[PDB]
Design a protein around this ligand. Structure first.
Ligand code: MG
Ligand code: MG
Length: 225
């Protein structure tokens, strides 16, 4: 399972979204190298202008690329579910605003790791920080706190994303996450631990389409050795 991740793996991301009736699609391409916890992805909005801020979709757009230190490798659910993959569902609750609900399937298609996502956003304020595009194009580091869910043979996660608002305030986005294997083979059910995530957003100077370039580093931590 983890043997599938010893080198560079091509990644494809495909999202279909509806936020307050704004219909959009995004296509992403890049690669992951779990040895270094490293993701490089470029996303393009193929329907035109993205109707929400790019940073609000970063978490939705492959935790199998996390670097699990050797001493913690028995806690890596994500790779253990491969190649058949996992379903990842989230509720992302924007404080004093709407919510996203997402359902993704993360699995190999041949030697490529694919993240296919459906996103539904409801109850957003017309000129809140999301639909009013008041969020800065940047990102703060965070931890993803993981716990086992033995009855669904899976995991749960909970974490807080803090999106910087252009006036110096912060837009909280509470994340609740559940992952379950697609296949029936055994998976690793971890002790409590977290993923330390650092994300940097940029633009391709040669790209005229609405887009996001993401560099992310993710390292598992939190288990005593
Ligand atoms: Mg290794
Ligand atoms: Mg134990």
């Amino acid at each position: 399972g983890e043997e599938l991740f010893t080198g560079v793996v091509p990644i494809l991301v495909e999202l279909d979204g509806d936020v307050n009736g704004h219909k959009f699609s995004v296509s992403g391409e890049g690669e992951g190298d779990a040895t270094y916890g490293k993701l490089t992805l470029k996303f393009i909005c193929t329907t035109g202008k993205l109707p929400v801020p790019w940073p609000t979709l970063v978490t939705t757009f492959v935790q199998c690329f996390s670097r699990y230190p050797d001493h913690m490798k028995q806690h890596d659910f994500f790779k253990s579910a491969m190649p058949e993959g996992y379903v990842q569902e989230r509720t992302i609750s924007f404080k004093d605003d709407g919510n996203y609900k997402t359902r993704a399937e993360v699995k190999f298609e041949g030697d490529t790791l694919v993240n296919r996502i459906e996103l539904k956003g409801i109850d957003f304020k017309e000129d809140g920080n999301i639909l009013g595009h008041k969020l800065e194009y940047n990102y703060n580091s965070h931890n993803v706190y993981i716990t086992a869910d033995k009855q669904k043979n899976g995991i749960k996660a909970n974490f807080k994303i803090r999106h910087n608002i252009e006036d110096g305030s912060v837009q909280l986005a509470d994340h609740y996450q559940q992952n379950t294997p697609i296949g029936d083979g055994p998976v690793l059910l971890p002790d409590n631990h977290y993923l330390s995530t650092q994300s940097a957003l940029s633009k391709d100077p040669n790209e005229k389409r609405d887009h996001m370039v993401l560099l992310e580093f993710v390292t598992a931590a939190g288990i005593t050795h």
